[PDB]
Amino acid sequence: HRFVQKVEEMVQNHMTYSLQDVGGDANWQLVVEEGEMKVYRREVEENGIVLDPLKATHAVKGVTGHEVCNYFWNVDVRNDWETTIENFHVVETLADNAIIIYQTHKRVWPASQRDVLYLSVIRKIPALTENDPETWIVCNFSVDHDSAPLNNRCVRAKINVAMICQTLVSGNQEISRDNILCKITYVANVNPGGWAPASVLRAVAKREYPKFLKRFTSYVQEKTAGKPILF
Numbered sequence: 001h002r003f004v005q006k007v008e009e010m011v012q013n014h015m016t017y018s019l020q021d022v023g024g025d026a027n028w029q030l031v032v033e034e035g036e037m038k039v040y041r042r043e044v045e046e047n048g049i050v051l052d053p054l055k056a057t058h059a060v061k062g063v064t065g066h067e068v069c070n071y072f073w074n075v076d077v078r079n080d081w082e083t084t085i086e087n088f089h090v091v092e093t094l095a096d097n098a099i100i101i102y103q104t105h106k107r108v109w110p111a112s113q114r115d116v117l118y119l120s121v122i123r124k125i126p127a128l129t130e131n132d133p134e135t136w137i138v139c140n141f142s143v144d145h146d147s148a149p150l151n152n153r154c155v156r157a158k159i160n161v162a163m164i165c166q167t168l169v170s171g172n173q174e175i176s177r178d179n180i181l182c183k184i185t186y187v188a189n190v191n192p193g194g195w196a197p198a199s200v201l202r203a204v205a206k207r208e209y210p211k212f213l214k215r216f217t218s219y220v221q222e223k224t225a226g227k228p229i230l231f
């Protein structure tokens with residue numbers, strides 16, 4: 001499909017940069033921590049646009065990266081976990097692993113409602129050799145599409161989001177979910193597409209990103225429990 005190059009650019013970008021440790025960087029703050037979940041933010045505002053890069057890490061017992069990415073990507077289960085959208089639909093299917101989605105986000109007073117139009121792609125990045133697990137990634141990034149032009153009702157946000165998952169598996173007996181741990185890195189770079197009250201936006205992000213990570217990861221745990229493990 002016509003976006004194959006852009007997909008590879010985004011996958012490469014995230015594998016090169018999004019797994020780099022920000023813990024030693026004075027500009028990055030740990031804003032929320034609960035259990036194995038850590039949410040970081042770097043405050044960035046340019047010409048009255050709040051861009052605050054966000055990065056979170058998590059470690060989720062009993063699920064694989066393939067499972068986590070499938071659930072994050074699969075639109076059929078989206079409404080079971082996502083709480084920040086008013087509506088969404090698939091604009092176009094590009095490939096078995098790549099779709100273009102239009103969605104509107106719930107309005108947060110006093111700001112105008114935002115909409116977003118993004119390519120969502122799920123990819124397996126194999127290890128150097130078969131004895132190593134390596135990574136599953138979902139990239140959600142804004143693209144242009146003639147069927148979803150700008151409208152006068154919503155401010156068009158632009159996003160670059162990735163969920164990156166690595167799976168740790170620890171006799172001749174069957175592997176148990178007790179011995180699997182999924183290490184998650186989640187990054188979100190959102191351009192709100194226009195002005196917003198900075199403190200209101202920042203408070204919403206600080207509330208909603210951890211809420212999402214907790215809800216979504218617990219959802220994957222609930223839905224995979226008892227089911228055969230999809231490595």
Ligand SMILES: CCCCCCCCCCCCC/C=C/[C@@H](O)[C@H](CO)NC(=O)CCCCC
Binds near residue numbers: 105159205
């Ligand atoms: C005063 C408020 C001003 C508001 C202005 C900013 C609004 C920007 C809306 C754009 C938000 C895009 C969120 C990304 C969504 C997708 O990748 C995905 C599936 O929906 N979900 C998450 O990554 C989970 C997303 C979790 C979000 C908390």
